Amino acid sequence: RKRIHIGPGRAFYT
């Protein structure tokens, strides 16, 4: 559910 932050300006919901 939460937002995953994988890099500068790069994120996604699982």
């Epitope: 939460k2 932050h5 500068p8």
Partner: antibody, heavy 123, light 108 residues
Framework: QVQLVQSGAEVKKPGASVKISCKAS????????MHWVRQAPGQGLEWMGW????????RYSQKFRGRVTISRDTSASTAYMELHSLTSEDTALFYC????????????????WGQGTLVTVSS | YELTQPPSVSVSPGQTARITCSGD??????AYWYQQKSGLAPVLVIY???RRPSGIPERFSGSSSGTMATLTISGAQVEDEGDYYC???????????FGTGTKVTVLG
């Protein structure tokens, strides 16, 4: 097997700059971001910033924004951290670490870590 | 942004040790846990609140609810002594921080 090899120990005089390197192999360098972490002797971990190995965008923690430049060279598969205008109080161990997170990764977090680079600052 | 941790937790061998991590935006962001033993790089032990990487023993588990995440070491052993740090992003998501850190002591 993911491998991150950092450059060796440094000593600098106050006001100098130092550029530490972190050579990555065993994975696609442009797919993942690279974290940089500082640990002063006997203290906790401090996150400094990170960079996308692909598009090169960076973000920096409040403490180090304006004092450091993180960069990457995809053709050398290496990430870099430059620390400008060192003072003696900057003496610390520095780590790079690969972010394992990705749209197509089942994991996230700093799974793989370099061995650390000691930087000593003194006159 | 601070992730607040207790400076010290003690546990008797075979008992369950719990290390908490409090932060204002943990309701929206994932927590990660790192173990650092004497003279070594940190090791990722729990990710995305409650998932365990391969090769990490099953006695490590995590959970998170509201503004507190918790790392649980069931049946703690001497080899589990070390410094434990949680990690998460601030509200923007552009920056991570490590928590204030917890030293785990195994009694007896």
């Amino acid at each position: 097997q993911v491998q991150l090899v950092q450059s060796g120990a440094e000593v600098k005089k106050p006001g100098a700059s130092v550029k530490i390197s972190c050579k990555a192999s065993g994975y696609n360098f442009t797919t993942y971001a690279m974290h940089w972490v500082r640990q002063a002797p006997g203290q906790g971990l401090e996150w400094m910033g990170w960079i996308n190995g692909g598009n090169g965008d960076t973000r920096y923690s409040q403490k180090f924004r304006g004092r450091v430049t993180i960069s990457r060279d995809t053709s050398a598969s290496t990430a870099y951290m430059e620390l400008h205008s060192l003072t003696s109080e900057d003496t610390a161990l520095f780590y790079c670490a690969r972010e394992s997170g990705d749209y197509y990764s089942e994991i996230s977090g700093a799974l793989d870590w370099g061995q650390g680079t000691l930087v000593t600052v003194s006159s | 942004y601070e992730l607040t941790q207790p400076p010290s937790v003690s546990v008797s061998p075979g008992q369950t040790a719990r290390i908490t991590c409090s932060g204002d935006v943990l309701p929206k962001k994932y927590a990660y846990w790192y173990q650092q033993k004497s003279g070594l790089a940190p090791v990722l032990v729990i990710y995305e609140d409650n998932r365990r990487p391969s090769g990490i023993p099953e006695r490590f588990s995590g959970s998170s609810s509201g503004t507190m995440a918790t790392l649980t070491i069931s049946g703690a052993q001497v080899e589990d002594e070390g410094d434990y740090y949680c990690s998460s992003t601030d509200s923007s998501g552009d920056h991570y921080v490590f928590g204030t850190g917890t030293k785990v002591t195994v009694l007896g």
